[PDB]
């Protein structure tokens, strides 16, 4: 049941929550379920930031030069993974992965052949914009529509043979899941919590420092 | 450019704070709640109905001579002034009215009908999350309101009311720390880290 996790750091992860980078809580988050047994972080040629962190020394991080997009940096990572059977790929910048979440999407080896994702249900009021413009086509219906969070998590050849082939063929892929979904799988949704934001816009940051307050907190 | 808001409340502290988030803008003379908060100069009690879409059109009889309607969910008590003030905007420029709104961040997912599966991915470029307050002439959204009701539309914001009946409101973009604070303990955590 060994498996690698994968972060595609090539470039907010730099940011810091307490003392600790967001891409060092997202590491450390996957780091908590004693499965994840190493961690590969691919990172853009000349970053010299990551060498500066105390996790550049932690004996179960490896690094690689990751590509210019996520597919290509992911598939960098999975070169080193050794005989992991399941991969696991995570935002470098989700600092706020809760365990038991990861613990429930971990159980998907037992029983899947495809793998899945954490998601988190629509439950507020979506808009489409006209193309173009920045003005209201529709409202968008939230039955069935889901948030793909990370990780994701697959067995490691199908993920590996799904994202060579979606990129020779010129695929549109945005996540793991959608090599898979190009390939005519469809992997699973595990529904996890709303508050595993991914930190990209510059008041992110705040709100993700208040979740994990708020957690701590609650967690008494 | 007096502007009326309309808050539907039909957890004090909650209602109060977004409440007071909205008259702190010089234009926004007064708060409609739609059902001692209820004993301030500025706000206004009346009956809302049992649909969110029901409470606002009541809190339209209650608007006086506003030409222009901010309608702003009790539980967004973090609205900053900024985003404010760059919808009451619109009221320069537009015939519509528009909302606040933040840009979708993941990959967003359909799932198969019956199973927690992955049918498809949805693109989520041009998806936006739509925020509160909504900004309306005053006489288009009763109209609008109350057609799309009448017409058994199913409205979930004030905007797919006008969106019904064929017009398109802006997107305004907004903070995305524009929360939804619905538990009364969060709310003083809230206000520290994002206020």
């Given at each position: 049941l060994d498996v690698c996790a994968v972060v595609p750091a090539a470039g907010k992860q730099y940011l810091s929550i307490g003392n600790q980078t967001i891409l060092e809580h997202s590491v450390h988050a996957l780091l908590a379920h004693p499965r994840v047994k190493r961690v590969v972080i691919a990172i853009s040629p000349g970053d010299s930031?990551?060498?500066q962190l105390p996790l550049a020394n932690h004996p179960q991080i490896?690094?690689?030069d990751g590509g210019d997009e996520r597919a290509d940096s992911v598939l960098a990572g999975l070169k080193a993974a050794?005989?992991?059977q399941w991969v696991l790929v995570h935002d470098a910048a989700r600092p706020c992965l809760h365990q038991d979440d990861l613990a429930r999407l971990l159980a998907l080896s037992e029983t899947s052949r495809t793998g899945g994702i954490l998601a988190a249900p629509?439950?507020?009021t979506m808009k489409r914009a006209?193309?173009?413009k920045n003005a209201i086509a529709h409202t968008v219906d939230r039955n069935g529509l889901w948030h793909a969070l990370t990780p994701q998590f697959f067995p490691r050849e199908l993920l590996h043979d799904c994202?060579?082939?979606?990129?020779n063929e010129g695929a549109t892929i945005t996540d793991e899941a959608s090599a898979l979904e190009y390939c005519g799988f469809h992997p699973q949704l595990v529904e996890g919590?709303?508050?595993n934001i991914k930190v990209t816009r510059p008041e992110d940051l705040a709100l993700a420092e208040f979740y994990?307050?708020?957690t701590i907190h609650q967690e008494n």
């Open positions: 930031r990551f060498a490896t690094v690689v050794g005989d992991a629509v439950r507020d006209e193309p173009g994202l060579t082939r979606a990129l919590r709303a508050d994990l307050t708020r």
